[PDB]
Amino acid sequence: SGLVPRGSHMMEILRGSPALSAFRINKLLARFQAANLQVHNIYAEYVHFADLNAPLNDSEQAQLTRLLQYGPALSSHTPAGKLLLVTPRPGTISPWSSKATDIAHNCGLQQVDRLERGVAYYIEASTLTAEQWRQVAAELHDRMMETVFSSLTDAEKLFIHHQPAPVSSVDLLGEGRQALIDANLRLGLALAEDEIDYLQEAFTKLGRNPNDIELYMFAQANSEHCRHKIFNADWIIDGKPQPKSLFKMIKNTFETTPDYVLSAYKDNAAVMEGSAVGRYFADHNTGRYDFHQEPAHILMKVETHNHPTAISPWPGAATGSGGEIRDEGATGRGAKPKAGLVGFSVSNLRIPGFEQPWEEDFGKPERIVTALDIMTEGPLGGAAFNNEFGRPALTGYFRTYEEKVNSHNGEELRGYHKPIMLAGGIGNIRADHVQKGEIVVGAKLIVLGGPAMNIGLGGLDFASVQRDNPEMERRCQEVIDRCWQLGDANPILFIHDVGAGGLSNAMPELVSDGGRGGKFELRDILSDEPGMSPLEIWCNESQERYVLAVAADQLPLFDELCKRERAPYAVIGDATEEQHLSLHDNHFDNQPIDLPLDVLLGKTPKMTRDVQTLKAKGDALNRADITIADAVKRVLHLPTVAEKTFLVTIGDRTVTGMVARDQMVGPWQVPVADCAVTTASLDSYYGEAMSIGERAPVALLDFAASARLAVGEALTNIAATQIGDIKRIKLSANWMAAAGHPGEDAGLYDAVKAVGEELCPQLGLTIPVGKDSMSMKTRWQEGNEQREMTSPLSLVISAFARVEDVRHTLTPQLSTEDNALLLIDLGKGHNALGATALAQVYRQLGDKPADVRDVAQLKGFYDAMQALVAARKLLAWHDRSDGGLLVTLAEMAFAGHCGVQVDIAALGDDHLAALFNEELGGVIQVRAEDRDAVEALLAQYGLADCVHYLGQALAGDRFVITANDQTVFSESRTTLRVWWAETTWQMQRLRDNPQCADQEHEAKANDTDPGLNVKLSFDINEDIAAPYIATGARPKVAVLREQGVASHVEMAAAFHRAGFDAIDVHMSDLLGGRIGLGNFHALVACGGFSYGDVLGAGEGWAKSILFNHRVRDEFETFFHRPQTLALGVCNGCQMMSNLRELIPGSELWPRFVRNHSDRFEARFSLVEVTQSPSLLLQGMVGSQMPIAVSHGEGRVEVRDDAHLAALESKGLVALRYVDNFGKVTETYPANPNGSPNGITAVTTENGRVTIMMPHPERVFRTVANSWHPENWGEDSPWMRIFRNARKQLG
Ligand SMILES: Nc1ncnc2c1ncn2[C@@H]1O[C@H](COP(=O)(O)OP(=O)(O)O)[C@@H](O)[C@H]1O
Ligand SMILES: [Mg+2]
Ligand SMILES: [Mg+2]
Ligand SMILES: [Mg+2]
Incomplete structure (x- = not known):
């Protein structure tokens, strides 16, 4: 390895492994060929750069070399051709760097100051000109984040030391x-x-x-x-002063309906009442996990990150998640994020080779990315944050819209060049922590989280490129958790997230919210950029930071908590009696800030907006080129309608072990669930629900109708969940607009009034939280002319509710038992076609849109559904939204893998309008014998004239719509279901391994797929551990975790149910002597993302053990005892595979590397239990059942076929992926990761150690299985693993 002077430090260069698989190499060659660049070949290798503060001895050097050997074992090539090295841009530090450097330090290499990575490309193209070489270089990097260098030695530029820049005065x-x-x-x-x-x-x-x-x-x-x-302005509209601000109209909802609300408009989340349940966590004194029966109240928040996403979509979306997760954790005096939601609105995709007939290229600003690039990189960034942080992402929306329409301001381009990038979620909070505490004079003022850089200052436009490090945020969340888990002894007096303005907002707002002042020392703030000015230090928008206040006498406790989680923190000030803000600088011996807070926080006058109504005249839909059949095909091809798998399976849906209802439904795992449901705890059937409603294109015709439909749809999406009182449902209202665009301001006011003053109070719905984003328009020069793309007014409503019984949730999965399909048409036969998917796909807006037609009937619908749910009278439900009744029925048939026979003669003579209107309502399926009783129930709620018997779900493949004796539309359901899949297919195909995309798509066309199905070799209800539990003797299990790991609570709970005392064992506990493995007979290593998987999943964790001789010895000793048991799941499996030199009987084990898809896979996959020595799978051999999978590096990799054959002949394979036909498979996604022979678990020769990629601990509760047989009780098959462990110990 290379090693040169780099200032007072020395940089070493270490070559890594090949960086691109063959499909990605071929994509690059095809792109160069399409650009007329004659490239013969291209090869890429990772290169690592280590900036060292002191030398490495030979042992240390070999350790660093070994740390930097990771990833799939692709074949190395001798470098040939022109070197282009791509690295992060000078002045930036990759999140890769932060994590890799933490691993080096936790492996005892303190001489590493910083590690960074690049990609060395070797391009053979002997005939190119200097200009053409620039286009090659352009193709190989992201101009917003990266730079291209011609020498490896050029990477020295990434580590230049800069002296602090001084403060500058402005000479007033x-x-x-x-x-x-x-x-x-x-x-x-x-x-x-x-x-x-x-x-x-x-x-x-x-x-x-x-x-x-x-x-x-x-x-x-x-x-x-x-x-x-x-939102605080006074208004004058059409010459009349209005009596309330927008904010006051939102608050009207809380004034009207305070019920169940614990906190609104006084924190960066709202809180509502939850349920009393067993909150499960590890005690501060004993480290044992225990249930604490208490109220688990529910917090909620939804935010957006629209501007940065247009510039750099991956970090835009990622830090959109990240900032929202921080608002949750900083609710009250500390709280715990539980589950997430995600929304995107973009312009037309225009997927190459799959352009749709409504799409026209209107141009865009050079400085922004395309809609397609947002929907490629953005979901991956948001998902990487949720995955790595560890919250499941369980509901969302994705709308495309870009058209030239005759709207309120006449003919113009309306769309989403500046996208909607929306992130939200729910969390749980303790009752006594809901209220922010008072800040005592002399409280210590702390920054919890990452060393800062000059990022995002004031929100090419480099300042709009954000930076995401979810592992840092997880480490902080662990500290927050330790704090609130101390109950009365929670040392956090006050906490806030650090967002816009950085510390310059967050610290003044913290002291001001306590009625205090603050004095701060600039040099106590953690920095990763010593060159920063005071302005940059104070104002930068670096991520993964929180501010909080602690009493001085609690600092030693706080320090212990942080050091155990490896969460960086700094005390940077003191709260003062005087309401003054002081920032001192010990380096420059001066005072960058010295201001009374009332001066700093003092306000110019309130705004007044004096505006006028504009209203579009609709035009009737021109139906010349429209036929029912062509409309069905087009609508199924609108992304807004079409299957969403590309957005779903990239995100974990199982972490926490509390997910009851995720997006994917039924045995065919079709993403059509209308809302998300989680359990409140690991020991309850009480829970929480989340839904979304939104209908922006309606606002191009009618502003108020668009807002009423967003509220209505949130209710219809949530309605087949067991909640009860509508007043339990709480909303976030997220308002996106182009304020100042003609007609939008008056429309905004009218829409806020429509929901805040009118619809929500009449229904009894509170809006206790919300946000606004008010510059949703993009302008540029397109040839000679000014061009503009302006969003419709875009209200997104998220609904949140406490759930009475998660088991009673209905989905769109039709039964083929004798049944009736009933439409509930809350449109009352209006059948509006304006601003529908139908209109859009024919490049029109139409005349009049849908709207809430009857408030009492909307409420009546909800209450009727709640009565039907609680009485178990529904087989299925699916609401009507984009694509109308047609799409509702279609989606139900897809989920039930069946047909329908329905008649629409009662819905009007206009069959197009009956099938494609997007009026509120939906289809219920009931048992045939219940039809009359259900109809009578609906009639009691005033709905009889809205209710229409449509027909029946039937076994088979026919989707038939009649009207009297005429066939209106008839098609194969499989054909429809594959059309509806084409968008996700094409997105997967361009983003992931196209072989995998193709396999997944083509499997959908085989109607004989029986879906997920079970075969059980044992009695799943037989608690074989009961006689041991009944003695009260509870063996310990070490539930092992590392920084970044999020899977440990539910792992503990699984072993707890089997009779163990689950002990929280952090790698810091082993390294500090607080735990020794000699005291345990069982250990489990848990999943998640230790170190963000940097340096290869599980590698940093494993090498941190191997390179500390003491801890290494401890592990080796444990594994060589005669009766100890160990389990490694997911990240634990990866870790243990990398530790196998310590594990007897493991010589044939494989490595676990990047999935063949090249994509994270969150799947509910079918496995079979195979014959092996594994003690933990005793009794289960031959069983076949699904399991949660959530990984990006789960592919079994062997050295060669000799190694695979040996492992197989030894008989150590314990689980294999099968297809739904029951055969061992390598086809995707049935096998989600490309493992040979479906391998996904191995054991040792003695059976005492078992490692597996799937997560049995997430699915040991039947209620947490996305699909399961109806006759199961509380326990799934997977419970037997933990019971086997207990019985084995005796
Ligand atoms: N951006 C997203 N991220 C994750 N899941 C999403 C996203 N968009 C849609 N989904 C999910 O895909 C399914 C279909 O979405 P959609 O058709 O928009 O729902 P609906 O029409 O019921 O409002 C739902 O389960 C929804 O939660
Ligand atoms: Mg839909
Ligand atoms: Mg729906
Ligand atoms: Mg929707």
């Missing part, structure tokens, strides 16, 4: 107001005239010049994004 006293005008422009403060006035007067009064940092702080605090001026 020496130049007058012009100094503030110049700074306004130079610093991009975007100050209004009245804000310059305020600053001029404030600093004139103080008799000194403002520092740059003070102006920047002020400017960030007074932005639209931070201050919410529009």
Whole structure:
């Protein structure tokens, strides 16, 4: 390895492994050929750069070399041709770096200052000109995040040491107001005239010049994004002053319906009442996991990250998740995120080779990415954050819209060049932590989380490129968890997330919220960029940080908690009685900030918006080119309608072990569930539900109708879940608009009024949380002309509710038992076609849209559904939304893998309008014998005239719609289901391994697929551990975790149910002597993402054990005892595979590497239990049942065929993926990762150690299995693993 001077440090260069698989190499060659670049070949290798502060001895060097050997064993090539090295841009530090460097330090290599990675490309193309070489270089990197170098030695530039930049004053006293005008422009403060006035007067009064940092702080605090001026403005509309601000109209909902609300409008989440259940966590004193019966209240929040996503979609989406997760954890005095939701709105995809007939290229700004690139990289970023942090992502939306329409401001382009990138979720919170505490004078003021850099300052446009490190956030969440788990002894007095404005907002808002001042020391803040100015330090929008206040006497406890989780923290100030803000700098011996808080936090006048109504005249839908058959095909091809698998299986849906209802439904795992449901605890059937409603294109015709439909659809999506009182349902209202665009402002007011003053109070729905994003428009020059793309007003409503029994949830999976299909048409026969999917796919807007037709009937629908749910009278439910009744029926037939025979003669003479309107309502399926009773029930709620018997679900493949004796539409259901799949197919195909995309798609066309199905070799209800549990003797299990691991609570709970005392054992506990494995007879290594999988999944964890001789010895000793048991699941499996030199009987084990799909796979996969020595699978051999899978590096990799054959002949294979026909498979996704012979679990020769990629601990509860046979009780088959362990111990 290479090793040269790099300032007071030395940089080593270490070559890594091949970086690209053959499909990705071929994609690059095809792109160069399409661009007329004659490239003969391309080969890529990772290269690593280690900046060292001191030398490595030979042992240390071999350890560093070994740390940097990872990943799939692709065949190495001798470098040939031109080197292009792609690295992060100078001045940036990759999240890869942060994690890789933590691993080096936890392996005892303190001499590593920083590790970084690049990709060396070797291109053979002897005939290219210098210009053509620039296009090659352009193709090989992201211009927003990366740079191209011609030498490996050039990477020295990434580690340059910079001295701190000083504070700069702005010379108001020496130049007058012009100094503030110049700074306004130079610093991009975007100050209004009245804000310059305020600053001029404030600093004139103080008799000194403002520092740059003070102006920047002020400017960030007074932005639209931070201050919410529009939502607090007075209004005049069509010449009349209005009596309430938008915010006041939202609050009207809480004034009307306070019921069940614990916190609204006073934290960065709302809280509502949950259920009393067993909250499960490890005690601070004993480290044992135990249930604590108490209220688990429910917090909720939804945010957006629209602007940055248009510039750099992966970090835009990722930090959109990240910031929202921080709002949750910083609710009250600390709380715990549980589950997430995700939303995207973009312009037309225009997928190459799959362009649809409604799509026209209108151009875009050069500086933004395309809709397609947002829907490629954005979902992967948001999913990487949720996956790595560890919260399941269980509901969402994805809308495309880009058309030239005759809307409120006449003919113009309406769309989403600036996208909607929405992230939300729910969490649980303790009752006594809901209220933020008071901040005592002298409280210590702390930054919890990552060392900062000059990122995102004030929100090419590099300042819009964010940076995501979910593992850092998980480490912080663990600390928050330890704090709230101390109950009365929770040392957090107050906590807030660090978002816009960075510390410059978060710290002043924290002390101000306590009625205190603060004094701070700049040099106590953790930095990863020593060159930063005070302005940059204070104002940067670095991620994964929280601010909180702790009593000084609690610092030693806080320090212990942080050090055990490896969460970085710094005490950076003290709360003061005086309401003043001081920031000192010990390096420069000066005071960058010195301001009264009332000066800093003082406000210019309230805004007044004086505006006028515009309203579009609709035009009747021109039906010339429309036929029913062509419309069905088009609508199924609209992304908004079409199958969403590309957005679903990339995100974990099982972590926590509390997921009851995820997107995928039934044996064929079709993503049509209308809402998400989680259990409240690991020991309850009480729970929580989440749904979304949204209908933006309607706002191009009618602003209020669009907002009423968003609320209505949230209710119809949630309605077949057992909740009871509608007042249990709480909403977030997220408002996206192009404020100032003609007609939008009045429309915004009318829409807010429609829901806040009218619909929500009448229904009894509170909106206790919300947000707004008010510049949803993009402008650019397109040839000679000014062009503009403006969003419709886009309200997204998320609904959240406590659930009475998660078991009683209905899905769209039709039964073929004798049945009746009933439409509930809340449209009352209006059958509106304006602003539908139908209109859109023929490039039109139409006349009049749907709307809430009858408030009482909407409420009646909800209450009727709740009565039907609780009385178990529904077989299925699916609501009507995009694509109308047609799509509702279709989706039900897809989920039930069956046919329908329905008649629509009662729905009007206009069959197109009957099938494609998007009025509220839906289809219930009931047992035939219950039809009359169900109809009578609906009639009691005032709905008889809305209710229509359609027909029946039938076995087979026919989708038939009649009207009297005429066939209106008839098609193969398989044909329809494959058309509906084509969008996800094509997205998967361009994003992932196209072989896998193709396999997945083509399998959907085989109607003989029987779906997931079970074969059981044992009695799943027989608690073979009961006689042991009945003695009260409970063996310990070490539930092993590492920084970044999120799977440990539910792993503990599985062993707890089998009779174990589950002990929390962090790798810091072993390294610090607090736990020794000699005290345990069983160990489990848990899944998740230790170190964000950097340096190969499980490798850093394993090598941290191997390279500490003491801890290595401990592990070896444990594994060589005669009766000990060990289990490794997912990340634990990977870790243990990398530790196999310590494990007897493991010489034939494989490695676990990148899935063949090249994509994370969150699947509910069918496995069979195979004959092997494994003690943990005793009694289960020959069983076949599904299991949760959630991994990106689960592919079994062997050295050669000799190795595979030996492993197989030894008989150590314990689980294999099978297809639904029951055969061992390598076809995707039945086998999700490409493992040979379906291998996904191995054991040792003595059977005492078993490792597996799937997660049995996430599915030991029947209620947590996405699909399961109806006759199962509480226990799934997988419970037997943990029971076997207990019985084995005796
Ligand atoms: N962006 C997304 N991320 C994850 N899941 C999504 C996303 N968009 C849609 N889904 C899921 O795919 C399924 C179909 O979505 P959609 O048709 O938009 O729902 P609906 O029409 O019932 O409102 C649902 O289970 C939904 O939660
Ligand atoms: Mg839909
Ligand atoms: Mg729905
Ligand atoms: Mg929807």
